[PDB]
Amino acid sequence: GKCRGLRTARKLRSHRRDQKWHDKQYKKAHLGTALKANPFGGASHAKGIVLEKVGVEAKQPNSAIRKCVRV
Amino acid sequence: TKKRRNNGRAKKGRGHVQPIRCTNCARCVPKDKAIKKFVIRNIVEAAAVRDISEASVFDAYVLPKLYVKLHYCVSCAIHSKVVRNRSREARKDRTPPPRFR
Amino acid sequence: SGALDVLQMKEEDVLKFLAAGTHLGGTNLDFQMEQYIYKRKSDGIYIINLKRTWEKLLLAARAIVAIENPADVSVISSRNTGQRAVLKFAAATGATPIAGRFTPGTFTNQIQTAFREPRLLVVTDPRADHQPLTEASYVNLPTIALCNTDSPLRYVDIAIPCNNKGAHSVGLMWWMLAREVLRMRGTISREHPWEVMPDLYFYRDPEEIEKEEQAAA
Amino acid sequence: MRAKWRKKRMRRLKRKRRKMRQRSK
Amino acid sequence: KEWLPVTKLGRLVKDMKIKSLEEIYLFSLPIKESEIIDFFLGASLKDEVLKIMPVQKQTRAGQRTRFKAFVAIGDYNGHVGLGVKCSKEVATAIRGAIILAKLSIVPVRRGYWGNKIGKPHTVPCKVTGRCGSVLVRLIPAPRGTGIVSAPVPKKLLMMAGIDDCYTSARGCTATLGNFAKATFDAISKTYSYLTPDLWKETVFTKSPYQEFTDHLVKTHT
Amino acid sequence: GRVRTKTVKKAARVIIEKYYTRLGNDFHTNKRVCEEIAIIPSKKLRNKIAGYVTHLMKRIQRGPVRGISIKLQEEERERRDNYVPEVSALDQEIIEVDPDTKEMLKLLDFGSLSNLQVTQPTVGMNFKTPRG
Amino acid sequence: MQNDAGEFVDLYVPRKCSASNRIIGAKDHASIQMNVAEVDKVTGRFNGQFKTYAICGAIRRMGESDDSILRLAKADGIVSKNF
Amino acid sequence: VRMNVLADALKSINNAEKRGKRQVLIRPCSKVIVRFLTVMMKHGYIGEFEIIDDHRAGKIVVNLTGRLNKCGVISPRFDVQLKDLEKWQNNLLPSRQFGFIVLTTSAGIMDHEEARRKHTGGKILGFFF
RNA sequence: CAGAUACCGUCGUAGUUCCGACCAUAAACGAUGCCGACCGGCGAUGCGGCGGCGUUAUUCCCAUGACCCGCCGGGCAGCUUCCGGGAAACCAAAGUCUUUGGGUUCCGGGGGGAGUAUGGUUGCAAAGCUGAAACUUAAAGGAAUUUGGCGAAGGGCACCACC
RNA sequence: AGGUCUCGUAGACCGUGCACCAUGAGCACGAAUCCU
Ligand SMILES: [Zn+2]
C-alpha cells in the first residue's frame, strides 16, 4: 500500500481490480477463452470414440516410445 | 553490475558534452571521456643535440620544443600501451604514476 | 581528579610543560577533542589546555592504581620514539612492556606462548596503533591513550590530550605518570622532591648518542 | 540475435503484410 | 583425562570458586574453554544433529568435497547454543561443530501471557532476529499451546526450554543453516530488549578477576 | 646458486646464541667448534654451518643484527640508556612564550612567571602548503 | 520478574550502561566495567573506596565514551567542577 | 511541505533515542505534542521537557532517559472503538504486559487503559513502549 | 579470403548546412519520480553576504578589484567509517522497516509466444500510442568465491621450445 | 697573488599500427555416525 488517506477507497479498489486483472490464474478463471479452450468444457470426465492408435516417443533424456490413441 | 562510481567519465551535472575526434584512429569520442595526454617533446633527442650545438651559427643557442596534445579513446590508448588495467582495490586511485626521472 | 587542594600543580609542572613543548598541537583538529583545546592562534597551530591534561593524568593514575596487581597493566608503544619510556615505566611500576612489533595474537589466541590477558591497557597513540585497540575490543580491556588533537578517538576510555610527535613531551608525560602512580601507591612521598632526573626517560637518535659520547666522558 | 535486427525483420514483414492486405481487401 | 587450563577463567573455575556461569554472562566475559560448560552442564545437556550438507570446490583435478555439519546444544530449562564446522571427514566435523556450539551458548528469559502464575511458559515479548535474508518473529502464546513452527526451529525452541511460541517466517527458508542461524539470532536477542520490569540501577558487584587476582598471582607466575 | 636453508641458518643462530666466546674468523677453528658443541649427521652441512657462522662473525664485527642477541654486545644498550648527565635539558633559564600562550597562562593559575619572556607573533598567517 | 507469590522468574538481572542505559548482553564483549580509585581527603594516598563505572560497546565503537566517563566523574565528584 | 506534526515529532524523538542523544530539539510546539509528552511523562518513560515560547511555533527541548524503545504514529487518523481495541492491542504491541495506545477522545487525550476505564472511544493517535 | 556484394583504400548519389511545413522516438541511463523532517565528519570547489593579521594598483587615508585565514545558505561533486540498509555489488541514501502507517502519482507478477494479430486513433509517408489469445516449457535470471581457457596485460623458466 | 668553482652524476620515456586464422557426432557421475 502507498496511498494512506482516511477517505481514499475508490483509487484502492480501482488499483486492486486492475492489478487483480494482471494475474495468470485469475485470468484463467475470469475469461471466456480459458473456459472455451478446455477440451472437456469444465468436465472431469468424458466419453469418446477410438479412431486409431498412435505411437509417440518420449523426450531426449529418457528414451522410450509410448502408446496413445486418437479419441 | 556497475564497475565504477562514475562511468569512465567526469560528466556529473551536464547530461551532454561535445564530441571530438581521436588521433590514432578516427573514432568519434566525447571530450570528457577520452584519455587525453599533453607531452612536452623536443625537436631533437639527446643524440643530435651535440651535433646541432657544435655546428651552429650561435653558441649556446636554446632549442625550441614540441608541444603537442594527443586525444585517445579507450581502445587506442590500451592497444598503444598508454593506460593499463588494475585490480579492483587498486582501481580507486586518481593519482598519476610517479616520475622518478 | 583535582577536587582536593593538595593534588594540583604547584609552580614547576607548568614550567616543564612549557619547557618540553607540550603546549602546541597539530594543524588538524578532532571534533572529539574540541573541548581539550584552548583556542587556535596564527600559523595554524592549536594551543592546548593544561588543566584538562592534568585531570586526565589524575584519572589515568587512578585507573592504574585501582587494581592491586602491577602485572595486569600493559603499556604498549610501536613507534621508536617511546620504546625506552615504556621500559622505564614498567621498571618503575611493575607493568608489562610491549615495545615494537605488536604481534596480532596476544589477547585472543590461546595456544601461543605470548598469550596475555591483562586488566588495563595504555597505548601511545590511536593513529599508528590502530591494531591493538581492535584486538583489545574483543576481550573486556579498557584503553588509555596519549592522544593528539588530530588522532581519532575510537574504542578508547580515557583520552589524555598530549603532544605525541616529539620525544620530549612523551618522555616527560611517561615520567610524570610514573611519578603520580608511585605517589598514589605510597612508596613515593607527595611533597619531597624524589627526582633522580627526568632524563632517564628521554629518547634520542643514535647519531646524538655518538655525539654526546664524544662530547662527554 | 540482438533485438535490433529482429525488430527490423518484423518491421519488413509488417510492411509486406500491410501491402498485401491493401492489395487483397 | 585431566584438565589443564591456560586462561585465568578456566583455572579459577577449576579452583571451585565459581558457583554458576550466570555471573559470567553477567560480566559478559568470553567463554573460551569449552570444558567449563561441560563441567557445569552435565547430565542435563544433550545434543542432536540437524543436517550435513555437501560443499564442493573445484581444482585442476577433480572436486574437493568438504562436509559441513550443523548441530545445536542446550539444556531444556534455560541455555541454548548453535555451532557450525566444516571438515573432510564426518566424525571430526560433528565433533568440531559440537565444540563450537559449546563455545557459544546464551541464556534466555521466559515471560507470561496475561497472568503471572507459576513458572513462565513463553517468550516475554515479540523478539525479532534477522540474518541473511531470513526474518524470524517470535510472538508470545497462551499457556498449553505448544510450539508451532517449521520442524527444526520447533526442535530448537523445545531444546531452548520455551513451551509456547507463535512464529512467522519469510524469504528463502530452504537454506536450513541460515534458517537455524536466524532462529538462533531471534532467541539470542531476548535479553537485549528493555522492559519496565528492570529499570532500577543495578548494584555493581566486584569483578571475579578483581576478587581473586591475588589467588591467580599466587597460583601462576 | 648458493642459497642456504632454514636448518643451517637456524642452527647457526642457536650456536651463536649459546657459544660466542670460543669462536673466531678462522674457518677451520669454528669448523672444529661446530664438530664439538653440536652433533652432526653429515659433513657438507657441517661445512655450511661453519662458513655461515664465519659470515655471522664478520657481520657481528661490523654491527648489530636483529636476529640474535649476544650477551657480550648486550647491556651496553642499557649503559647508553642508563646514564644521567648534569642537565636535564628542561631546567633552562629562559623559555620562549607566545602572546596567545601568554593569555592562556594569564587565565591559568597565575599572573606572571619570572622565567618566561614574550615573543612577537608572525606578520602573515599563511601556513598551508600549496596543493590545489 | 515478580508474581502473586513473590519469587523472581528471571534467573539474573543483567547490568545496564551508565551512559546510554542499555542492557548489556552476554555477547557484548566490548562492554567494560572500568574501576577507578578514590583518594583520601588529607594525606592524598590510596584508601580503599572504589567507584565502578560501566560502558556499553555501541558508544565505545562510536568513540564517545571518554566524555561519558568525564561527565560521570563530574557528577560523582571526582573531577573538579571548574574544569 | 509540513503536513502532519505528530509524525515527524515522534520520528525525531525515535531517531534521537536510538542514536543515543541526551536532549532533542522539536521545532514546532503544537498542543497535541504537548499532551502526548505529558501522557508519556506521567507514564514515566521520558524525563522533564521544556518548551520555548515566542511569537511563532516555538521549540521544544526534552530531557531523554534510557527507558524508551520506539515512538510510533498511526497515520491517517483511523477510527477505533471500545469493542475493537483489543485487536489493535494484539497486533500493535510487543506484549500484553506493558506499552500504551495514546488516542484522542471526547474525554481528552490519554492512554488505552484510562480510555477503557472511563468507557469512551475516539480516533487513533499513536503508540509507544 | 576457399568464398567477401564485409574489416581496408579511391571516387561517389541522397544526406550533413539555413529557411518554412511535418513524426514524436533514444542505453531520452543517476538503468534510482516529486515535496518535507531527522540522524557521523573531513578537505577542496562555484555564487552572494559577514568578520579579521599582513602584501599589491609603488610608500598617508577611505572603500574597492587581486591574495591569506574563518563563517553562513543554495548548488555540482570527492574520501573513510561495525550509525544503519541490502542476497551481494554497493548506498550518507538505495538509512530512519515485523519496532512494518509523512502526503501523493505512475508501474510488475515464472520463461517464450509478443510489442505479435485484431479493434481504435494520428500522420503525405515511415510509423507513434493503446494492446490480446490459443499453445509450449521447469526453468529463464541477479550478486559473488574457487580451477578452467583466453588472437588480454605484467614477472620469469625450459635444446622433449627458439636463436 | 692564485689559473679546471664546490658536492654524487638513469647521461636510456624514438613511433603509430602488424598477413590469413573456420569447424567438433553423443552414449561416460555416486553424497553418510558413533563405542564397548
Ligand atoms: Zn581511435
Side-chain angles (χ1 to χ4, degrees), chain C residues 100-112 114-124:
Chain C
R101 193 39 196 161
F102 177 75
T103 64
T106 60
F107 297 152
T108 183
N109 191 14
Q110 82 272 52
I111 62 170
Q112 270 187 116
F115 173 48
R116 294 176 201 76
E117 52 183 0
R119 291 172 53 87
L120 277 296
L121 182 51
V122 194
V123 65
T124 187

PDB file of all heavy atoms in Angstrom, chain C residues 100-124, unseen atoms left out:
ATOM      1  N   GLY C 100      57.455  -2.235  20.119  1.00  0.00           N
ATOM      2  CA  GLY C 100      57.775  -2.590  18.751  1.00  0.00           C
ATOM      3  C   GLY C 100      57.291  -3.965  18.340  1.00  0.00           C
ATOM      4  O   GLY C 100      57.538  -4.949  19.047  1.00  0.00           O
ATOM      5  N   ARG C 101      56.614  -4.025  17.189  1.00  0.00           N
ATOM      6  CA  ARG C 101      56.086  -5.246  16.569  1.00  0.00           C
ATOM      7  C   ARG C 101      55.135  -5.984  17.520  1.00  0.00           C
ATOM      8  O   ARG C 101      55.422  -7.062  18.044  1.00  0.00           O
ATOM      9  CB  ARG C 101      57.223  -6.149  16.066  1.00  0.00           C
ATOM     10  CG  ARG C 101      56.785  -7.284  15.123  1.00  0.00           C
ATOM     11  CD  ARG C 101      55.692  -6.846  14.153  1.00  0.00           C
ATOM     12  NE  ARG C 101      55.020  -7.982  13.534  1.00  0.00           N
ATOM     13  CZ  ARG C 101      53.834  -7.918  12.945  1.00  0.00           C
ATOM     14  NH1 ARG C 101      53.155  -6.785  12.879  1.00  0.00           N
ATOM     15  NH2 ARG C 101      53.315  -9.020  12.411  1.00  0.00           N
ATOM     16  N   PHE C 102      54.004  -5.330  17.768  1.00  0.00           N
ATOM     17  CA  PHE C 102      52.899  -5.949  18.495  1.00  0.00           C
ATOM     18  C   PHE C 102      52.314  -7.053  17.624  1.00  0.00           C
ATOM     19  O   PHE C 102      51.672  -6.783  16.607  1.00  0.00           O
ATOM     20  CB  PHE C 102      51.848  -4.905  18.852  1.00  0.00           C
ATOM     21  CG  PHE C 102      50.637  -5.468  19.538  1.00  0.00           C
ATOM     22  CD1 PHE C 102      50.698  -5.865  20.866  1.00  0.00           C
ATOM     23  CD2 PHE C 102      49.435  -5.593  18.857  1.00  0.00           C
ATOM     24  CE1 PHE C 102      49.581  -6.384  21.502  1.00  0.00           C
ATOM     25  CE2 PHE C 102      48.316  -6.108  19.485  1.00  0.00           C
ATOM     26  CZ  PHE C 102      48.390  -6.504  20.810  1.00  0.00           C
ATOM     27  N   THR C 103      52.554  -8.303  18.011  1.00  0.00           N
ATOM     28  CA  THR C 103      52.079  -9.436  17.229  1.00  0.00           C
ATOM     29  C   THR C 103      50.562  -9.554  17.349  1.00  0.00           C
ATOM     30  O   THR C 103      50.015  -9.371  18.445  1.00  0.00           O
ATOM     31  CB  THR C 103      52.750 -10.731  17.687  1.00  0.00           C
ATOM     32  OG1 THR C 103      52.367 -11.023  19.036  1.00  0.00           O
ATOM     33  CG2 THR C 103      54.263 -10.599  17.614  1.00  0.00           C
ATOM     34  N   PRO C 104      49.850  -9.848  16.258  1.00  0.00           N
ATOM     35  CA  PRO C 104      48.383  -9.808  16.297  1.00  0.00           C
ATOM     36  C   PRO C 104      47.731 -11.071  16.840  1.00  0.00           C
ATOM     37  O   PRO C 104      46.796 -11.590  16.224  1.00  0.00           O
ATOM     38  CB  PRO C 104      48.001  -9.591  14.824  1.00  0.00           C
ATOM     39  CG  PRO C 104      49.295  -9.264  14.108  1.00  0.00           C
ATOM     40  CD  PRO C 104      50.347  -9.978  14.881  1.00  0.00           C
ATOM     41  N   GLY C 105      48.200 -11.580  17.974  1.00  0.00           N
ATOM     42  CA  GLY C 105      47.580 -12.748  18.567  1.00  0.00           C
ATOM     43  C   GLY C 105      47.772 -12.857  20.065  1.00  0.00           C
ATOM     44  O   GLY C 105      47.599 -13.937  20.638  1.00  0.00           O
ATOM     45  N   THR C 106      48.141 -11.750  20.711  1.00  0.00           N
ATOM     46  CA  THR C 106      48.465 -11.798  22.133  1.00  0.00           C
ATOM     47  C   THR C 106      47.214 -11.933  22.992  1.00  0.00           C
ATOM     48  O   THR C 106      47.199 -12.705  23.958  1.00  0.00           O
ATOM     49  CB  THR C 106      49.246 -10.550  22.537  1.00  0.00           C
ATOM     50  OG1 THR C 106      48.452  -9.387  22.277  1.00  0.00           O
ATOM     51  CG2 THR C 106      50.538 -10.457  21.749  1.00  0.00           C
ATOM     52  N   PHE C 107      46.159 -11.194  22.661  1.00  0.00           N
ATOM     53  CA  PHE C 107      44.982 -11.099  23.513  1.00  0.00           C
ATOM     54  C   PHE C 107      43.889 -12.101  23.158  1.00  0.00           C
ATOM     55  O   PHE C 107      42.915 -12.218  23.908  1.00  0.00           O
ATOM     56  CB  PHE C 107      44.399  -9.681  23.453  1.00  0.00           C
ATOM     57  CG  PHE C 107      45.326  -8.609  23.966  1.00  0.00           C
ATOM     58  CD1 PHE C 107      45.241  -7.316  23.472  1.00  0.00           C
ATOM     59  CD2 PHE C 107      46.273  -8.888  24.940  1.00  0.00           C
ATOM     60  CE1 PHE C 107      46.085  -6.322  23.935  1.00  0.00           C
ATOM     61  CE2 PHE C 107      47.122  -7.900  25.407  1.00  0.00           C
ATOM     62  CZ  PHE C 107      47.026  -6.615  24.903  1.00  0.00           C
ATOM     63  N   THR C 108      44.017 -12.825  22.047  1.00  0.00           N
ATOM     64  CA  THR C 108      42.894 -13.625  21.570  1.00  0.00           C
ATOM     65  C   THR C 108      43.266 -15.051  21.168  1.00  0.00           C
ATOM     66  O   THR C 108      42.385 -15.911  21.074  1.00  0.00           O
ATOM     67  CB  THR C 108      42.212 -12.908  20.401  1.00  0.00           C
ATOM     68  OG1 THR C 108      41.066 -13.656  19.976  1.00  0.00           O
ATOM     69  CG2 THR C 108      43.176 -12.710  19.244  1.00  0.00           C
ATOM     70  N   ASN C 109      44.546 -15.324  20.926  1.00  0.00           N
ATOM     71  CA  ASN C 109      44.981 -16.664  20.548  1.00  0.00           C
ATOM     72  C   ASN C 109      45.511 -17.387  21.780  1.00  0.00           C
ATOM     73  O   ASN C 109      46.557 -17.015  22.325  1.00  0.00           O
ATOM     74  CB  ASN C 109      46.042 -16.606  19.450  1.00  0.00           C
ATOM     75  CG  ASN C 109      46.325 -17.965  18.842  1.00  0.00           C
ATOM     76  OD1 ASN C 109      45.574 -18.919  19.045  1.00  0.00           O
ATOM     77  ND2 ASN C 109      47.408 -18.058  18.081  1.00  0.00           N
ATOM     78  N   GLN C 110      44.799 -18.434  22.204  1.00  0.00           N
ATOM     79  CA  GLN C 110      45.074 -19.077  23.484  1.00  0.00           C
ATOM     80  C   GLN C 110      46.213 -20.087  23.428  1.00  0.00           C
ATOM     81  O   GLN C 110      46.692 -20.510  24.487  1.00  0.00           O
ATOM     82  CB  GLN C 110      43.809 -19.768  24.000  1.00  0.00           C
ATOM     83  CG  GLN C 110      43.545 -21.147  23.401  1.00  0.00           C
ATOM     84  CD  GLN C 110      42.747 -21.097  22.107  1.00  0.00           C
ATOM     85  OE1 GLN C 110      43.097 -20.381  21.169  1.00  0.00           O
ATOM     86  NE2 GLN C 110      41.667 -21.868  22.052  1.00  0.00           N
ATOM     87  N   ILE C 111      46.662 -20.489  22.235  1.00  0.00           N
ATOM     88  CA  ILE C 111      47.699 -21.515  22.149  1.00  0.00           C
ATOM     89  C   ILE C 111      49.096 -20.939  21.985  1.00  0.00           C
ATOM     90  O   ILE C 111      50.077 -21.699  22.033  1.00  0.00           O
ATOM     91  CB  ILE C 111      47.453 -22.493  20.984  1.00  0.00           C
ATOM     92  CG1 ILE C 111      47.490 -21.753  19.648  1.00  0.00           C
ATOM     93  CG2 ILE C 111      46.122 -23.204  21.160  1.00  0.00           C
ATOM     94  CD1 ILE C 111      47.492 -22.680  18.460  1.00  0.00           C
ATOM     95  N   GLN C 112      49.224 -19.632  21.785  1.00  0.00           N
ATOM     96  CA  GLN C 112      50.538 -19.025  21.640  1.00  0.00           C
ATOM     97  C   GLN C 112      51.238 -18.929  22.989  1.00  0.00           C
ATOM     98  O   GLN C 112      50.603 -18.939  24.048  1.00  0.00           O
ATOM     99  CB  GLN C 112      50.421 -17.639  21.010  1.00  0.00           C
ATOM    100  CG  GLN C 112      50.486 -17.647  19.493  1.00  0.00           C
ATOM    101  CD  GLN C 112      50.543 -16.252  18.907  1.00  0.00           C
ATOM    102  OE1 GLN C 112      51.527 -15.872  18.273  1.00  0.00           O
ATOM    103  NE2 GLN C 112      49.485 -15.482  19.117  1.00  0.00           N
ATOM    104  N   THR C 113      52.570 -18.854  22.940  1.00  0.00           N
ATOM    105  CA  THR C 113      53.350 -18.676  24.159  1.00  0.00           C
ATOM    106  C   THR C 113      53.141 -17.293  24.759  1.00  0.00           C
ATOM    107  O   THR C 113      53.110 -17.148  25.986  1.00  0.00           O
ATOM    108  CB  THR C 113      54.834 -18.911  23.879  1.00  0.00           C
ATOM    109  N   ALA C 114      52.995 -16.272  23.919  1.00  0.00           N
ATOM    110  CA  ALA C 114      52.746 -14.908  24.383  1.00  0.00           C
ATOM    111  C   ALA C 114      51.254 -14.597  24.439  1.00  0.00           C
ATOM    112  O   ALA C 114      50.784 -13.605  23.885  1.00  0.00           O
ATOM    113  CB  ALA C 114      53.480 -13.917  23.489  1.00  0.00           C
ATOM    114  N   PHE C 115      50.493 -15.452  25.117  1.00  0.00           N
ATOM    115  CA  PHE C 115      49.060 -15.236  25.310  1.00  0.00           C
ATOM    116  C   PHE C 115      48.887 -14.428  26.588  1.00  0.00           C
ATOM    117  O   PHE C 115      49.075 -14.942  27.694  1.00  0.00           O
ATOM    118  CB  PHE C 115      48.313 -16.565  25.367  1.00  0.00           C
ATOM    119  CG  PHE C 115      46.856 -16.436  25.729  1.00  0.00           C
ATOM    120  CD1 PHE C 115      46.042 -15.508  25.093  1.00  0.00           C
ATOM    121  CD2 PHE C 115      46.299 -17.254  26.699  1.00  0.00           C
ATOM    122  CE1 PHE C 115      44.703 -15.394  25.425  1.00  0.00           C
ATOM    123  CE2 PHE C 115      44.960 -17.145  27.036  1.00  0.00           C
ATOM    124  CZ  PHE C 115      44.163 -16.214  26.397  1.00  0.00           C
ATOM    125  N   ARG C 116      48.531 -13.159  26.438  1.00  0.00           N
ATOM    126  CA  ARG C 116      48.357 -12.255  27.564  1.00  0.00           C
ATOM    127  C   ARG C 116      46.902 -11.824  27.669  1.00  0.00           C
ATOM    128  O   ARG C 116      46.234 -11.601  26.655  1.00  0.00           O
ATOM    129  CB  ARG C 116      49.248 -11.021  27.419  1.00  0.00           C
ATOM    130  CG  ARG C 116      50.739 -11.301  27.488  1.00  0.00           C
ATOM    131  CD  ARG C 116      51.538 -10.023  27.242  1.00  0.00           C
ATOM    132  NE  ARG C 116      52.914 -10.272  26.825  1.00  0.00           N
ATOM    133  CZ  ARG C 116      53.282 -10.667  25.612  1.00  0.00           C
ATOM    134  NH1 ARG C 116      52.401 -10.836  24.640  1.00  0.00           N
ATOM    135  NH2 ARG C 116      54.570 -10.883  25.364  1.00  0.00           N
ATOM    136  N   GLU C 117      46.413 -11.718  28.902  1.00  0.00           N
ATOM    137  CA  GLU C 117      45.114 -11.106  29.176  1.00  0.00           C
ATOM    138  C   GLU C 117      45.221 -10.220  30.416  1.00  0.00           C
ATOM    139  O   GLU C 117      44.959 -10.644  31.548  1.00  0.00           O
ATOM    140  CB  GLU C 117      44.004 -12.165  29.251  1.00  0.00           C
ATOM    141  CG  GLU C 117      44.196 -13.376  30.172  1.00  0.00           C
ATOM    142  CD  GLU C 117      43.043 -14.357  30.060  1.00  0.00           C
ATOM    143  OE1 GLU C 117      42.110 -14.088  29.275  1.00  0.00           O
ATOM    144  OE2 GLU C 117      43.077 -15.405  30.737  1.00  0.00           O
ATOM    145  N   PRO C 118      45.629  -8.956  30.227  1.00  0.00           N
ATOM    146  CA  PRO C 118      45.795  -8.045  31.366  1.00  0.00           C
ATOM    147  C   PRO C 118      44.479  -7.441  31.829  1.00  0.00           C
ATOM    148  O   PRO C 118      43.405  -7.881  31.410  1.00  0.00           O
ATOM    149  CB  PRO C 118      46.741  -6.975  30.812  1.00  0.00           C
ATOM    150  CG  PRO C 118      46.401  -6.919  29.363  1.00  0.00           C
ATOM    151  CD  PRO C 118      46.002  -8.316  28.952  1.00  0.00           C
ATOM    152  N   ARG C 119      44.547  -6.462  32.727  1.00  0.00           N
ATOM    153  CA  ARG C 119      43.357  -5.761  33.184  1.00  0.00           C
ATOM    154  C   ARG C 119      43.260  -4.320  32.701  1.00  0.00           C
ATOM    155  O   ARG C 119      42.146  -3.831  32.508  1.00  0.00           O
ATOM    156  CB  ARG C 119      43.281  -5.786  34.719  1.00  0.00           C
ATOM    157  CG  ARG C 119      43.012  -7.174  35.287  1.00  0.00           C
ATOM    158  CD  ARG C 119      43.143  -7.207  36.800  1.00  0.00           C
ATOM    159  NE  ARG C 119      42.322  -6.190  37.447  1.00  0.00           N
ATOM    160  CZ  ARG C 119      41.048  -6.356  37.776  1.00  0.00           C
ATOM    161  NH1 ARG C 119      40.411  -7.486  37.525  1.00  0.00           N
ATOM    162  NH2 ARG C 119      40.397  -5.361  38.371  1.00  0.00           N
ATOM    163  N   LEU C 120      44.382  -3.629  32.503  1.00  0.00           N
ATOM    164  CA  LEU C 120      44.396  -2.279  31.953  1.00  0.00           C
ATOM    165  C   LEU C 120      45.401  -2.210  30.809  1.00  0.00           C
ATOM    166  O   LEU C 120      46.414  -2.915  30.797  1.00  0.00           O
ATOM    167  CB  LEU C 120      44.747  -1.219  33.013  1.00  0.00           C
ATOM    168  CG  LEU C 120      43.721  -0.618  33.988  1.00  0.00           C
ATOM    169  CD1 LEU C 120      42.648   0.166  33.238  1.00  0.00           C
ATOM    170  CD2 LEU C 120      43.101  -1.632  34.943  1.00  0.00           C
ATOM    171  N   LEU C 121      45.123  -1.329  29.847  1.00  0.00           N
ATOM    172  CA  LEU C 121      45.979  -1.193  28.670  1.00  0.00           C
ATOM    173  C   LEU C 121      46.210   0.283  28.389  1.00  0.00           C
ATOM    174  O   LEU C 121      45.248   1.041  28.232  1.00  0.00           O
ATOM    175  CB  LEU C 121      45.348  -1.878  27.456  1.00  0.00           C
ATOM    176  CG  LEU C 121      46.146  -1.856  26.149  1.00  0.00           C
ATOM    177  CD1 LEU C 121      47.568  -2.334  26.370  1.00  0.00           C
ATOM    178  CD2 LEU C 121      45.467  -2.691  25.081  1.00  0.00           C
ATOM    179  N   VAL C 122      47.479   0.686  28.318  1.00  0.00           N
ATOM    180  CA  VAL C 122      47.877   2.041  27.955  1.00  0.00           C
ATOM    181  C   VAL C 122      48.676   1.971  26.660  1.00  0.00           C
ATOM    182  O   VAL C 122      49.562   1.121  26.515  1.00  0.00           O
ATOM    183  CB  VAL C 122      48.703   2.722  29.067  1.00  0.00           C
ATOM    184  CG1 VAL C 122      48.803   4.221  28.818  1.00  0.00           C
ATOM    185  CG2 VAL C 122      48.101   2.446  30.436  1.00  0.00           C
ATOM    186  N   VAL C 123      48.350   2.858  25.718  1.00  0.00           N
ATOM    187  CA  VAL C 123      48.960   2.864  24.394  1.00  0.00           C
ATOM    188  C   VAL C 123      49.352   4.303  24.061  1.00  0.00           C
ATOM    189  O   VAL C 123      48.744   5.264  24.538  1.00  0.00           O
ATOM    190  CB  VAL C 123      47.993   2.252  23.339  1.00  0.00           C
ATOM    191  CG1 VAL C 123      46.734   3.105  23.153  1.00  0.00           C
ATOM    192  CG2 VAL C 123      48.689   1.934  22.021  1.00  0.00           C
ATOM    193  N   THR C 124      50.412   4.449  23.261  1.00  0.00           N
ATOM    194  CA  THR C 124      50.979   5.767  22.988  1.00  0.00           C
ATOM    195  C   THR C 124      50.154   6.604  22.010  1.00  0.00           C
ATOM    196  O   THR C 124      50.086   7.828  22.171  1.00  0.00           O
ATOM    197  CB  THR C 124      52.438   5.631  22.511  1.00  0.00           C
ATOM    198  OG1 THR C 124      53.035   6.931  22.400  1.00  0.00           O
ATOM    199  CG2 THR C 124      52.581   4.844  21.197  1.00  0.00           C
TER     200      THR C 124
END
